[PDB]
Amino acid sequence: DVNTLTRFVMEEGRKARGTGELTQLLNSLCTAVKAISSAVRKAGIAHLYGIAGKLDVLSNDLVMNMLKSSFATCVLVSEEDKHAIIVEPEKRGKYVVCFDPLDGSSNIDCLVSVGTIFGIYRKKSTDEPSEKDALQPGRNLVAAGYALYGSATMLVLAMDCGVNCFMLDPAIGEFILVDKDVKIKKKGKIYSLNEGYAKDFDPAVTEYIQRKKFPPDNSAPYGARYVGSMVADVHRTLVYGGIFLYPANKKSPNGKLRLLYECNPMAYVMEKAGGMATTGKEAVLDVIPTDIHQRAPVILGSPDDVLEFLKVYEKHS
Amino acid sequence: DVNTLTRFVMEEGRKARGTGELTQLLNSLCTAVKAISSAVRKAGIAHLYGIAGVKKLDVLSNDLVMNMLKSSFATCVLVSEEDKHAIIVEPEKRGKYVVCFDPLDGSSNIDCLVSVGTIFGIYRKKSTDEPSEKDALQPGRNLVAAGYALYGSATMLVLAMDCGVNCFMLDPAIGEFILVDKDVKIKKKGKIYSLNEGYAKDFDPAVTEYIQRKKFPPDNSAPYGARYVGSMVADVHRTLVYGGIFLYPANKKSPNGKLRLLYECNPMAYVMEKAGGMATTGKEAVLDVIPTDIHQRAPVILGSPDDVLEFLKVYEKHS
Amino acid sequence: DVNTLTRFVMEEGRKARGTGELTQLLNSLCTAVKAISSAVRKAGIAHLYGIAGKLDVLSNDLVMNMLKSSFATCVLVSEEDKHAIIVEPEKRGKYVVCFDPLDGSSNIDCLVSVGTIFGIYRKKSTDEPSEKDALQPGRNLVAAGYALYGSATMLVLAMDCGVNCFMLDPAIGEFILVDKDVKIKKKGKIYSLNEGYAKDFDPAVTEYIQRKKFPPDNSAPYGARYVGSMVADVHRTLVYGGIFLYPANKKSPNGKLRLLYECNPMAYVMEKAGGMATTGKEAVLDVIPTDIHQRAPVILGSPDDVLEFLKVYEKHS
Amino acid sequence: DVNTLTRFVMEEGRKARGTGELTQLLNSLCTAVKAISSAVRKAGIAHLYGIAGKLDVLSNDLVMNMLKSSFATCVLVSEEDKHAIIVEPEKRGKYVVCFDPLDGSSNIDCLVSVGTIFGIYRKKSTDEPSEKDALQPGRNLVAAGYALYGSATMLVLAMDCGVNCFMLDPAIGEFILVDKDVKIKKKGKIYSLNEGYAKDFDPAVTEYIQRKKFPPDNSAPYGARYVGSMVADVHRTLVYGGIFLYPANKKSPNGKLRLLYECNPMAYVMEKAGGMATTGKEAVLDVIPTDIHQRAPVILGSPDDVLEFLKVYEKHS
């Protein structure tokens, strides 16, 4: 049987006997993703070049407005906004959404894959909403995922029931369920990180990478891929197995990627798919944030690969 | 004033006072590129998943380019990554051009929605003999036009001719390629290197040393960043837009590289040179290699001239 | 605030505190209508013409399959199917849907506007589902409407809350709320019927049309429009007012249009918009059917114009 | 072999060994038509209704800017413009284009079919370009035709080589040739006119319509169709045969449709398809215009039907 994103979400919502607030949340977000996708693929650019005589701001506005008007949110945290947005009282719902509206857009000049990342938490207080409602560990995530604007557009949605992948059919504007209850391979054959900054590596990362290229047990060398767009590399890791690293070093002891709207959603997708996600010191989902824009190191992917990196990390005390 | 690919090609054709065969050629390729883009973005996939109650993308892509080029009446010999032998166009549809193309490069990893692309190179048939596979064995210096479509976050067609390199963005709402970047030039020197460092144990010593100099510069300057998509069109386009260097070099297991000379290396080498970049195998210019086999491989190092020159200096230190 | 069809229906569903089944049905129909519009506009026609070396059947399959897989239906009546379709037990829901998957498609060779018409009933007995469950008067409709595939694609949805019009945005595949709680004019200036068959007219139809062209007083004669496609003529009647007639005569004493999936849904839309719909003898919505494909005469539109027609009709009785 | 609009025009152009100017014009016109088609279908309407927080004018701007920038035109007459537009000196070419950028858009509130109509002349005088260069009879047309934005978008192009029909495939933005060297039926079975003006009809029109409804020779009466959008009514006349009439009435004693960019292009298409187009007094294409927006009565379509009307017209002197 064919299934769509909206029908899938409604059926899971009905099973859970929920009120519908989360469904309204996701349906609005799905609409914003379709509008982002259309602009990313440059529909209407002929009018910009005068046929009749920005993108990351629009993406933020599309997500902000669709979530606000959904009546399911009260606090919105965005890569694009210095402070958390508080939904106006008459529009308030019970959910907090942290999102990166258009990740990778710094390099969109070369048409690199880009994506939208989102994580959804339930509000913690019964009081007036505040930024504190966004300062939850990832363990409390109710749902998370991302849209990948790659050769085609795909939305990956992770919840308690697992991870499901939906392909956007642009002919009809519907996300089609194409991969159900996906699980990452136990062990992959690809590592992904910016090796150009090797001069700064932590000793453990230097050693772990050394083992991928010159395996001690005669086994085959790993291949290397690094798009430089986090959603594209994390999605490749999910589909093919392997490991993705944006680790801590001396110049960046807490990493570069953002915990609330990059690290935590991807870790949740990974764990629901049977993978792992560590900062080196602890599971990503266990870091308790004190700032909405704080950074975290991240190593994630196939469990045998993350376990192997953690073994090397532990050897270096 | 707005410009489109078709309007661009016609006006250049009129300047040159040609017969129109090349314009008919490029317009047919353009049409195939839009149909490939439409299929790559998965338009209509809901029907494959039973919305009402089936071919492979690289086979469909090859059929699109083949049929549009045959039906243009502008071609006589067609070389495709997908066909062991050259296709010789039937007599009533024959024109004067030879086209080498990779209909969907990078589709090996299309399971992960990696950027993919179409690569093409266009030659004038040179002899009066009957057309045969031999007419495709010209060095890249003989290219009349070349370029690629990149199906990335957006679809873009990059067209290189003697007048320079021009970039056209596909507007999907109207199906037109809009000229968005005119006469593009690559930076003299970049800050990105691009290759599969996972296979370092097999590197040529010159490659090992050069990568060493990028990560640990002797002159203390900032280390280069590293990017490698694993899809040639995406990595080369980033090299063209941001500068730097792309390497797919020879080693002892692969003394002739892995990428194919006729429909991957030569078209990309040609685009790079028309943008003021460089493309070498280490031993010679990519465009000067005289091929003997239409599917033969070639090592390729390309990009910003200063970065490729620095590779050649290290490569020379290793004789 | 922007609104979509799915978001609108969800909000009305939560207001009514229903189970979610009707929302699941309408979301399924909406996906089907987007697929029909895409095919009607000839997406992919290049492949049928050899670039790489049915419409009403496809339309029927899209609606049947999306409704079946919705888990919201038990009996489906279609213009295309001789007998009612009974949904298999594992997919049965509580609604009966009568529909015309592609009305007007006989003349689609000239690219005339075409459309999809639907009507939704609640199954009334606990018996095994059967064709008899579709033989309810239109008064029993829970929801009805039509998709018009015209210069643009529009979904008109009528429920107890009134009539609402949604425009399909093809760039994102969403039905956008553009006209809320629409009402038809009290009196129009257009009449619509096939005047080519005047030799067969009932005397009352002949007299009423003669008065529209030759008014007894000084007022302006009505203009005439007849597309020949029911959804287009009825929709123009909705937007501009006036009267649409496909009446009974001696050769066709029960009319030509079908009651279940053409007359009743349109009659329902008209009455929720403040209009009227009569067979001449009684309201269309009060006819109790005895056959799923039975015909009914229909005269509909602005109430003053239908009342004026009934006055002439009664003069000849 | 598959064929497209651009490839067809290039191939016919090379056959004639022309310079390419007309091809550049028609290619520019095709580009504007696809943009008009996308706008008519409401692409991007979601942004007008706040998803992120004038059609006939846009249509005219698209055609004007695309034709000016083609370097193939020198004088442009548009339904939207009071005076002929004189192309600036550096962009002037040898062609004059009369066009209706969005015909029927008055009633687009009901999503009625609309269309673009065009006629193309070679400039005939050696004077400086002026409004007078647009005043040639339709006999002088080099090319003409129309785009119909109906259930699908279709371009009909008539030249000396005959009439050809191209279907826009919206998935790739290309006009696909689907009907080659089309000919109209010798006699049709549909008549088309606004019968609401019956009180103002000339005796010849009244008699002819009477003959369609009450045939003297026992034959079947014609059916009636009238969309009220000329491109839709004319296109149907071409595809199915029959007759289209817009005669003069009291509001319009010189007729209502405009000679330059409605009557002539359609008359030209009709004659190249083996049909007919008369004012009653003379062939439409032979009328010598004196004013760029002047009106004309028009009767057109299948030749046996237009000849039958002329018989009645001669009977009434």
Ligand SMILES: COCCc1sc(S(=O)(=O)NC(=O)Nc2ncc(Br)s2)cc1C
């Ligand atoms: C981990 O995710 C838990 C699963 C849940 S729970 C919700 S919900 O709370 O929004 N409830 C509902 O939507 N109920 C409904 N009733 C009728 C309709 Br028609 S939808 C959504 C999802 C995806």
Ligand SMILES: COCCc1sc(S(=O)(=O)NC(=O)Nc2ncc(Br)s2)cc1C
């Ligand atoms: C390096 O390439 C040189 C540039 C060239 S030369 C040609 S051509 O040979 O095809 N000639 C023509 O197209 N003539 C025409 N006449 C009228 C029209 Br309308 S187009 C195409 C291009 C892009």
Ligand SMILES: COCCc1sc(S(=O)(=O)NC(=O)Nc2ncc(Br)s2)cc1C
């Ligand atoms: C005659 O009906 C008019 C009003 C109604 S009642 C229904 S319903 O029965 O399907 N109930 C629901 O959809 N409940 C929901 N809960 C959560 C979500 Br989220 S939707 C749909 C409509 C449009």
Ligand SMILES: COCCc1sc(S(=O)(=O)NC(=O)Nc2ncc(Br)s2)cc1C
């Ligand atoms: C009066 O209609 C006769 C048919 C004609 S003649 C012209 S034209 O004058 O524009 N010439 C050309 O287009 N030449 C070209 N050379 C190369 C390419 Br490729 S096209 C267009 C059409 C449709």
